[PDB]
């Protein structure tokens, strides 16, 4: 049994606010979290509740999934796919170190169109 590392309630409850939502546990730790307390975006929120929202610590790359440098890892808070900013297709050096979307989301982004 997990819960938001920020309220420790239970998704349908934001305990610290007693309001409903939907946590996100780490597919490694189990540490759940409300995307509201996580500052996530919808797409993230929706993507992280279904697949492995490896807690930001286990987050690592997706282009490596090793954490390697983790000083470049770009955390797509649109699902949680970190990419050492020099792993991306348009690799950055600093630019969107935190936010920024990933490629799976993008190809899926463009796919969302039409």
């Amino acid at each position: 049994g997990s819960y938001c590392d920020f309220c420790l309630g239970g998704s349908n409850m934001n305990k610290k606010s007693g309001r409903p939502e939907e946590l996100v546990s780490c597919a490694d730790c189990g540490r759940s979290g409300h995307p509201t307390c996580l500052q996530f975006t919808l797409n993230m929120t929706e993507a992280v509740k279904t697949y492995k929202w490896q807690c930001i610590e286990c987050k690592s790359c997706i282009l490596c999934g090793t954490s390697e440098n983790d000083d470049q890892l770009l955390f797509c808070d649109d699902c949680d796919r970190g990419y050492h900013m020099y792993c991306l297709n348009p690799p950055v050096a600093e630019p969107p170190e935190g936010s920024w979307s990933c490629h799976l989301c993008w190809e899926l982004l463009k796919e969302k169109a039409s």
């Binding site: 920020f6 307390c37 500052q39 610590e57 890892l73 935190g98």
Partner: peptide
């Protein structure tokens, strides 16, 4: 988010979050 327990951190502000 913003990584759990494991130290004190590396930042002293409030900008950006979630990394490790």
């Amino acid at each position: 988010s913003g990584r759990g327990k494991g130290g004190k951190g590396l930042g002293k502000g409030g900008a950006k979050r979630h990394r490790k």
